[PDB]
Amino acid sequence: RTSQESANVKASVLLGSRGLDISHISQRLESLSAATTFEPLEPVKDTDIQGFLKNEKDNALLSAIEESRKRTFVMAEEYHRESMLVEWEQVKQRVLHTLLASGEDALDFTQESETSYISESGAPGRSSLDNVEMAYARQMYMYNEKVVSGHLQPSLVDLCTEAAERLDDKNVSDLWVMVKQMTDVPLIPASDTLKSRCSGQMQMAFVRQALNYLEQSYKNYTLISVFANLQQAQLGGVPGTYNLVRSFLNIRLPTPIPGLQDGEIEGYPVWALIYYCMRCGDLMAAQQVVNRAQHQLGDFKNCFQEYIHNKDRRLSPTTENKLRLHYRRAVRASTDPYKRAVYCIIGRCDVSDNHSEVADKTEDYLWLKLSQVCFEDEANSSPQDRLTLPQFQKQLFEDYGESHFAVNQQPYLYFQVLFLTAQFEAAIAFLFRLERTRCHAVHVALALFELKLLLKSTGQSAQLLSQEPGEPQGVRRLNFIR
Amino acid sequence: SHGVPLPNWLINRYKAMDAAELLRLYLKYDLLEEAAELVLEYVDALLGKGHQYFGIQAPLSATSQLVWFPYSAIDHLRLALGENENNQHNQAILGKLQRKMDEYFQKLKKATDDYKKI
Amino acid sequence: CNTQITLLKKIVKRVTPGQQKFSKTASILWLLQQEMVTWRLIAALYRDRIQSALEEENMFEIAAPNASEKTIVDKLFQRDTLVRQSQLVVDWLESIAKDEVGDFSDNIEYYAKSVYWENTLHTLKQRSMLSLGSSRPLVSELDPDAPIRQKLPLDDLDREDDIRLLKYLFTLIRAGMTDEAQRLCKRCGQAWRAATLEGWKLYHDANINGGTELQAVEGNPYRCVWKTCCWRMAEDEQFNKYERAIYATLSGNLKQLLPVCESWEDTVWAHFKVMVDSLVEQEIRASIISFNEANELPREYLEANWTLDSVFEELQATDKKRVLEENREHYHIIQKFVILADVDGLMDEFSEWLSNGKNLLLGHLLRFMTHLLLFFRTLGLQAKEEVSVEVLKTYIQRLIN
Amino acid sequence: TLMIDMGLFMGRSFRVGWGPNWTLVHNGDKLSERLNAEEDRDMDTIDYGFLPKPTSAKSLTESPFKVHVEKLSLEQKTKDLQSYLLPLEIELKNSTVDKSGPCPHFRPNPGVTAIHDYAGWVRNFSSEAAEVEAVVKQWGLTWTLCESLWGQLKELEASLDEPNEYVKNLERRKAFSHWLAQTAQERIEEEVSLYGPERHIEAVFSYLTGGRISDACRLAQKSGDHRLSLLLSQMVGSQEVRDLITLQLVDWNKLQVDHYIQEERLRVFCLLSGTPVWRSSDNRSINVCSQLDWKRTLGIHLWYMLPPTATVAQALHMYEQAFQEQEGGEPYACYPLPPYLEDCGFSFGDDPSAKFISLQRDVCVHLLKLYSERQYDLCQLLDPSSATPDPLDYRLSWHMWMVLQALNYTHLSGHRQGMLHASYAAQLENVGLWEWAIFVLLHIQDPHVREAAVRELLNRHCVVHDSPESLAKENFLIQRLCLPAQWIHKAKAVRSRRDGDKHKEALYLLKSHQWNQCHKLVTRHLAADAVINENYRYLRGFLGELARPEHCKHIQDWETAGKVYLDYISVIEMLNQIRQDECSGGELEKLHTKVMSLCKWVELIQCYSAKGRLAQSEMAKRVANILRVVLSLQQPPESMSDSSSEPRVPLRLLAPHIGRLPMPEDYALEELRGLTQSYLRELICGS
Amino acid sequence: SHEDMIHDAQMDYYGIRLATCSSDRSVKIFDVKNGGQILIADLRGHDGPVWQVAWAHPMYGNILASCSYDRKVIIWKEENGTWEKTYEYTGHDSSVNSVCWAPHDFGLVLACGSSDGAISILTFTGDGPWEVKKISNAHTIGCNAVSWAPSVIPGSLVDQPSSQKPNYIKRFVSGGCDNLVKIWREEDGQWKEDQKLEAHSDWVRDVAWAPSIGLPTSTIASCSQDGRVYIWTSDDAATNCWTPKLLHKFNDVVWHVSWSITANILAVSGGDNKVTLWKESVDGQWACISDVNK
Structure with missing residues (x-):
């Protein structure tokens, strides 16, 4: 069914060959897509009515046979369904008879895998290490000098970061960028991550650092994109949140898809502007956008401005209840993903909005998830946002697996997910599984130990990873000494 | 080589066969306005209805954003005009032809826009 | 050892990607399958040898046509030895093939398309159906020879799902998996092709008894001449790989069977196929009384002599480097000595093995050569004793390790 | 021309390409339009040498078209051979020849x-030929610096060396001093013409930069400069000397005498006092740096900043902190640059932004960093273009990192290592010295990557020709290069398959023993060629070596044709010779037995060519002729075998096989007539 | 000589014959010797303007392929001093634009892309059939430029001896006019999706595989109409490590990229009637080491 478009494009070509602006032709092709061909008040077209009508008859007969065969397909698919019902009845009785007669219709089974442990070896003089490890040796040597001297020294994170860039290992330097950023958003030690996770205030503060972290990270990637397109973005490194926003719209979303709610300011999608304002975290730019778009929003503009001023990131509970009552009954779905997500988050209800963000923007997926995640796991009148976060996390990791967003073969993505979700132990054991990453995980875990973190397993001849009751189940306790 | 014109039947046959080669036949010994009606016919067949006299198929098309153009020869034209400037009429012809050119191009951009709506 | 085969399969598959540490395990597992097929080969070969030794005193026969040609057939099957062991080794290889096959039936559940040349279908439909047709030439005919007879093109998706099913059934019949063959035919609607499959299978009936009841109705007795026709079609060429291979096979046509078989197993397989055919047709014409023109074949084809020596002489003389390198492989040498009973060659070759040492002859290799000698002795066959004791002492060196 | 026009189309116009010998093919204009004058068109060789043979020539009325092709040349060419050859002549011994691989x-x-x-040898040549280049001097510089950091000199090989760390440091420093002694020779020779007792304090500065107290004193005395001579000994006196100078100059500060004293002797005083930067009462910064080398800087640092007998590394550490930022403050020392870069200016410290602008880094300073700490990124050691204009001759530096591997250091990324291996072998293939590019390549461990590369070299370098120079080339390839002629025969064989020299393809196909394909091609062509031209010698040897059973094993259908025709020719020659002498029946019987047999297999001859069947026909006619001759002469004119008997003809066996081939009615007439009277008697005496 | 300016012209493996193709509707050939040269031929046939040819490897001999506007690819093999028209394919809707031979290690197969939005890959037995590997919807719009897999490049083969032969997986790259670049691997008998690349918001014009001899890594120079030249590099595609770097910000529509026969440097045709000669310097950066004014 390649029809319709191929007809309408050349129809517009011919109509423009006779005159009149594109608005009337757009309306005409709209009506062409509307109902069948030929007007009840009759066309009413332009020159070449003869070719018009020849192709119109051809498409009309196309449409007639389409209607007929589609009705027949309706009945035939119902018969398909009933036929397959009977067919599976037959296949089930087939399976029953096979099992009763020692026959089979096919079966499969195997066994799983258990921990296997491997290591490396050293060498003196002509040694088994690398230039990488030698550069690291300089850093930890100078670091340990101040450690033993009792002096205060910069973070090992940075130390090994500037250790990194000189090899032109820019991805690892970036990995240190994430690590150091998450250190810089501060993390109160509790002498083991179990204490931090058990402390309800610490998890709230960690959520605060995580949201600040992801906002700044998106802003950084926005900066990287803008500078990479600096010619397209039309700046010389010129600062300014507003012109940055406008240039970034010029690049990513100059034109929206057909089917949007609310018009565009000078050609920028309003909801896109608002969303990018939240994602970069520029509250002043968000206020500028909402002040410019106050007319499209009405009192909802004032509501959003009050929400912005509310660092609780939510309005009064009574207002929330009334608005969620309105949304559940009337507003619900629409043709604006941004509007739907905004209503869902303000009501703190509904987890339907997922959209399409795989393999380079799953971080925006994560921002979506966390923003809807509420501060309590206890099921309120919106239980879809009141959930055991650790179970949620673990099913995202293992149960959701690693291939849906294709992190079953990407190191940084899934790892960083585990880290930001605070699974430092299994994340480090993860890094251990790639040969070139062990020293790196060593530096990272040493930084964690500096921050007074990490889990421990009892024993000296015990293996690396263990699980111990008393700590919530599923969090492997890594034998640090192992 | 002996200074001789060409017969009409040959003209028509070899016109339906091959054009731009005959164009630089004109270039060989100064058949300027001759090349000029060639160009006229080129753009006209581009508009449609006349490709046959070139042994081509082009009644006007609506599927290709871009096709082959002998604009090399067109700038060769303007070059030869610069060479033998004494024919203000011919260069005015060139200008009107360039007007037809950019009419072609505005139609071209409209068509490209319409495709990019797809 | 098959259970252990499975054990190593499970290990190797449970290996994560990016680890060739168990590539060695998989390679040893491979050598394990090679020694397994060596077990099959020797066991069957010498059980046939035992049956021959039991039945030595009544070989070969003579008769004249008096009843249905299946009498000719089963006489021919019973009378000769050479073709008998050829049949057994073929059964070996194709038992290997069918074990590899298994449930390809249930697996094709997900290869299926049942619309004949659907692309050409829909495009000629739209040419007849629209304001605008197509500038593209296509057949007006669904004939299996519609294009090439008409020289008309066909669509790529059509022809390539074709090639895909050609892999399926091509493999199925290189294995001879005939039930699955008619299965696939009646999946994809090539009942014509399934019909084409039947041109060689002979004819019979024995309803000389009881009521009018089916004893056999199978086919058209025009088959000798029909294979001759296929013979000349091969001389005509212009085929796809699959049809070329299958019918050059049904003819035993060496040159047009060259393209597809390149493996050691495939080339020895083809040796046996060709020689079994040429023989079997020779005593067809011998048993069915005639010496006049009823079929045509080239003189050299008619007068080429056949022996088990020619098998391995062909195999060796293969100027194809795949077969050449496969020839020096140990398992191949072992099993072909199994066929040849070349005891002097085997003992010398064992001598160079032990000269290389025992690192090339792992503990299980030594045990396998040990069972080798064991069944030699239980057959009252004796190999060279110093070589035997060298192998065994190295093996016991392993065993004590 | 015209370029104004714009649009979505066009482009789909000019491109460029590369050709072998590192040349480039291009409609683009040449590179010699800035190298010579009065240029030409379609110039397709570097310099001159493109011959006036047919090319892209068009007139100038709408602009014509051309293509130039050029092989880029660099630097000057007088005797550039030895500069590369000698490092390689030494690397000969520095290398090994493992025979693994084909x-x-x-x-x-x-x-x-x-x-x-x-x-x-760098010095040896640098003295034997006074025509070396400053880049040669740069590479000798790098040679000496690497030697100093690891190599062992003769002054401590004629003297027992001692393992105490302090002994090692001082020995590394005294070697450094002897090095500077070698280096500053030409510097002294240059500024000595410049200066005089007028410039005597500048000479003082130079002499201090050298630590050349000896000849400084000799000059001062030949000039009668007693006070200055006495000052000279004090330059490296006891620390008390510097206590003296500190208090003395603090006094002069309180005395303001500097305003009345030239800062010239004052910078002498700073040099003596170890004060690199002076802060006057006016806070006048009297700095010591002038005309120097960074070499001279760190040498001063050694002799004067700390104990002159101290180590290498800590003095380097202070120097690096001195020309780097100290506490966010201004650098105060010299920032190392490669030679062609201090040709474009140099620094004495201060203003780290002017260091940030470009200011690469001297490779010599990087070597000290790798010699000081073993955890150095070594990445600062690379690109010998730092002390040279261009990185054209990586000889020295390459030899250096091999010596480093000998020293158990340079644990660097092998990809970069082999990449530079390729770069230097690329220099080699540029200069066109092939054996050399090869073995230089041969020291790397990626096996059939190496094999593919060397195949590239073989293809580019080996073209089938007859010349004593080429012969000497394989002489070199075999004697120490020891290179299996398998590859050379491969290359010259495909060369011959390109050009069509029948002798050469046949010879090298035999020599490389491509048994199957050589079989097939000779059958295709050579058999008919030799049989019709009667040149049995060559393909006689050919088939003789091919007949070896192993060859029969690796070729299909050898038995079908090759040894068959070998049999033909062998019978022909032996029957010829048996008549060249008096015949003996003990070989005549063999003649009959083998002839009447091979009659049975003449039938199986299969010709897939018109010329093949034509040679088959020629064979048939000749065998008929010789068979007639021998059947006539087997009853010799004086030793008849049978009295008068007309024996029964074996045509009863011959006919069923000879009737399987067609025959040309030219001589088929006489053959067929003889066959007629044969069948007449056969049928009159039939069954 | 040629009536129209030359797009492409290629010498042999041996430097002794030159093929020269223009859109001047025919392609002319010189023998090459002593600096002298005789136009040995001018092959006609191409009923569309000609852009590109394709020489094959020397162990096969002497083989040329060519594309034209007429959707015809003509296939030329040299005999006795005579190159001649040996196979020719059409069936295409838009002008066949990109043809490129595969490494002889993979064999005698040419890659044949056109702006059709889809691409075929054609094998010649050298005496026999022309095996067709046609991939539809290869582009949502059309194919601009394509590159093969060069057969052998470092990264895991140091431990693989020269005596044996490694597995030859087929892969390649290309970029089209749907504003996208894509990467392909061959398996199951067909090709599937290694990679999708969307960084040039405009059409890509030409693509350059760094001949990564000495490189474990995978290196791309992608030039588009948008003036952005991306060095795309991945040390490992399985860990998904492709990253963009700027090589140069030319302000012209950036046109052509071709590596040296010596596999050392890159020639880039710019919208300046110039071909910039870039070399990745020994250190870490891409330096335009020279230029040729076209």
């Missing part, structure tokens, strides 16, 4: 004499 593989074989022969 040709030998070369593994490294360096030690301590590796740089001892390189660098020493």
